[PDB]
Write a protein that holds these residues in place. Structure first.
Motif, mmCIF file in Angstrom:
data_model
loop_
_atom_site.group_PDB
_atom_site.id
_atom_site.type_symbol
_atom_site.label_atom_id
_atom_site.label_comp_id
_atom_site.label_asym_id
_atom_site.label_seq_id
_atom_site.Cartn_x
_atom_site.Cartn_y
_atom_site.Cartn_z
ATOM 1 N N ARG A 102 0.850 -1.201 0.000
ATOM 2 C CA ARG A 102 0.000 0.000 0.000
ATOM 3 C C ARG A 102 0.889 1.256 0.000
ATOM 4 N NH1 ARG A 102 -4.728 -0.709 4.609
ATOM 5 N NH2 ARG A 102 -4.542 1.534 4.181
ATOM 6 N N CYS A 103 0.434 2.313 -0.637
ATOM 7 C CA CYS A 103 1.158 3.581 -0.566
ATOM 8 C C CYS A 103 1.468 3.929 0.889
ATOM 9 C CB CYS A 103 0.333 4.695 -1.180
ATOM 10 S SG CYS A 103 1.019 6.366 -0.958
ATOM 11 N N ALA A 104 2.705 4.367 1.106
ATOM 12 C CA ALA A 104 3.195 4.642 2.472
ATOM 13 C C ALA A 104 2.363 5.741 3.106
ATOM 14 C CB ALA A 104 4.648 5.038 2.474
ATOM 15 N N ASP A 105 1.786 6.575 2.261
ATOM 16 C CA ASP A 105 1.222 7.836 2.777
ATOM 17 C C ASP A 105 -0.267 7.844 2.874
ATOM 18 O OD1 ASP A 105 3.773 8.896 3.237
ATOM 19 O OD2 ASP A 105 3.882 9.602 1.132
ATOM 20 N N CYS A 106 -0.917 7.382 1.812
ATOM 21 C CA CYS A 106 -2.412 7.411 1.753
ATOM 22 C C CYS A 106 -3.034 6.059 1.801
ATOM 23 C CB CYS A 106 -2.911 8.141 0.467
ATOM 24 S SG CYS A 106 -2.747 7.131 -1.030
ATOM 25 N N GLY A 107 -2.213 5.044 1.639
ATOM 26 C CA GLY A 107 -2.671 3.675 1.795
ATOM 27 C C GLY A 107 -3.252 3.051 0.558
ATOM 28 N N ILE A 132 5.125 4.538 -2.831
ATOM 29 C CA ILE A 132 4.004 5.497 -2.868
ATOM 30 C C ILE A 132 3.279 5.526 -4.180
ATOM 31 C CG2 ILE A 132 5.066 6.996 -1.144
ATOM 32 C CD1 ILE A 132 6.361 8.690 -3.087
ATOM 33 N N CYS A 133 2.069 6.014 -4.116
ATOM 34 C CA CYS A 133 1.238 6.097 -5.327
ATOM 35 C C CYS A 133 1.663 7.275 -6.193
ATOM 36 C CB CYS A 133 -0.271 6.136 -5.012
ATOM 37 S SG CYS A 133 -0.824 7.650 -4.234
ATOM 38 N N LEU A 134 1.109 7.278 -7.392
ATOM 39 C CA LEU A 134 1.378 8.351 -8.386
ATOM 40 C C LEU A 134 1.079 9.712 -7.781
ATOM 41 C CD1 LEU A 134 2.231 9.351 -11.210
ATOM 42 C CD2 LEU A 134 -0.158 9.107 -11.942
ATOM 43 N N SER A 135 -0.109 9.803 -7.220
ATOM 44 C CA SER A 135 -0.582 11.059 -6.608
ATOM 45 C C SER A 135 0.317 11.541 -5.501
ATOM 46 C CB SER A 135 -2.024 10.949 -6.101
ATOM 47 O OG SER A 135 -2.349 12.094 -5.327
ATOM 48 N N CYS A 136 0.687 10.649 -4.593
ATOM 49 C CA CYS A 136 1.587 11.071 -3.486
ATOM 50 C C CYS A 136 2.990 11.410 -3.996
ATOM 51 C CB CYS A 136 1.636 10.013 -2.379
ATOM 52 S SG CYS A 136 0.091 9.879 -1.403
ATOM 53 N N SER A 137 3.401 10.733 -5.050
ATOM 54 C CA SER A 137 4.714 11.041 -5.665
ATOM 55 C C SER A 137 4.747 12.461 -6.195
ATOM 56 C CB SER A 137 5.096 10.034 -6.787
ATOM 57 O OG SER A 137 4.443 10.309 -8.036
HETATM 58 ZN ZN LIG Z 1 -0.619 7.730 -1.907
#
Ligand SMILES: [Zn+2]
Length: 357
Positions: free
Chosen positions: A24-29, A44-49
């Motif tokens: 899961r993305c480290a930040d938003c899951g 992390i996901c695209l968005s969090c990147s």
């Molecule tokens: Zn994320």
């Protein structure tokens, strides 16, 4: 065999994504992250990147699959990763502190990343004082009651008095309004408020529901306010509910609305409706300072049913798509503009119906 060499480096870093801790993305899951901060050692996901890129002095990102990697970079991910980051960057996150989900507004997702990795608030807990001290004061922009203009006003949140207060734009020692914590619900509403940092505070005064709409220029400041408010709620609930676990209470600190929007109510008249847990509130407009009324929605088991359409011999000009709510005592009729509106409302109602009392 350099082909084999390259292949092995590629599958090494991919295999890190294939560790459960990194699922899961480290930040938003969000599941299945595809990116990495090769400096923070997280997946992390695209968005969090995209957010990470805006703190380049802290985080540098690459695609796990589509970028070239150095051995040492892969090694760093391998020695680090999302579990490691949890232990390092989320070591001292207070239980009351709101953790964002992928459907949260940008402010919350951004500030979470900044708090963890830039400001390092959960590594150095003295940094938590803004939202942890049980007292906070500062200025905020508050939407006028009956108009669209914002005015800068002093706010004070004081646990000792169990309230959030604001003051007039003058010298006066006495507050303009006192908002008790016991029934205060703060949710971020940027779309509705028309500011990206827009916070809605909804509370109970004189046995009626009231709203204010506020923001701060600085993302950190508003999010500190939000978390301070959660802290106050938490400390309140702990008193109110002895023997309740943290997990019992945390979901109650604040509550996003199940659904909001325009519906017609019984002649039929258009109102702005807000489903808050079991409480269906209405207003003249979304930025109304006060609830014009409210309907309670209990469990199926308690005699509540949600039905499609209008009853026979319903009369009037209305929106096409009806919903009827049967209560042990009454009937409530609503008209929705569209089918997807209807479907949406039906489902929100059903959420309350399906949940036991
Ligand atoms: Zn994320």
């Amino acid at each position: 065999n350099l082909y084999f060499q390259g292949k092995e480096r590629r599958r090494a870093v991919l295999e890190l994504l294939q560790r459960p801790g990194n699922a899961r993305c480290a930040d938003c899951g969000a599941p299945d992250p595809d990116w990495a901060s090769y400096t923070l050692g997280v997946f992390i996901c695209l968005s969090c990147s995209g957010i990470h890129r805006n703190i380049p002095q802290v985080s540098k990102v690459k695609s796990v699959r589509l970028d070239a990697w150095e051995e040492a970079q892969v090694e760093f991910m391998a020695s680090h990763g999302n579990d490691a980051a949890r232990a390092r960057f989320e070591s001292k996150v207070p239980s009351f502190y709101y953790r964002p989900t992928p459907s949260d507004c940008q402010l919350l997702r951004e500030q979470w990343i900044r708090a963890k990795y830039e400001r390092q608030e959960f590594i150095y807990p003295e940094k938590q004082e803004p939202y942890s001290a049980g007292y906070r004061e500062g200025f905020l922009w508050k939407r006028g009651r009956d108009n669209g203009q914002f005015l800068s006003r002093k706010f004070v949140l004081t646990e000792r008095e169990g309230a959030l207060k604001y003051f007039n734009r003058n010298d006066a020692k006495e507050p303009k309004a006192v908002m008790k914590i016991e029934h205060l619900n703060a949710t971020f509403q940027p779309a509705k408020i028309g500011h990206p940092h827009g916070l809605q505070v909804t509370y109970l005064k004189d046995n009626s529901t009231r709203n204010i709409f506020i923001y701060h220029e600085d993302g950190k400041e508003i999010v500190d306010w939000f978390n301070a408010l959660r802290a106050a709620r938490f400390h309140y609930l702990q008193v109110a509910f002895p023997g309740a676990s943290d997990a019992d209470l945390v979901p109650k600190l604040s509550r996003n609305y199940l659904k909001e929007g325009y519906m017609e109510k019984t002649g039929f008249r258009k109102r702005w409706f807000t489903m808050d847990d079991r409480r269906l509130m209405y207003f003249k407009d979304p930025l109304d300072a006060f609830a014009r009324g409210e309907v309670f929605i209990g469990s199926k088991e308690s005699g509540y049913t949600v039905l499609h359409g209008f009853p026979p011999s319903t009369q009037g000009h209305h929106w096409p798509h009806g919903i009827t709510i049967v209560t042990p005592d009454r009937k409530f009729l609503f008209a929705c503009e569209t089918e997807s509106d209807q479907r949406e409302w039906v489902a929100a109602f059903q959420k309350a119906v399906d949940r036991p009392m």
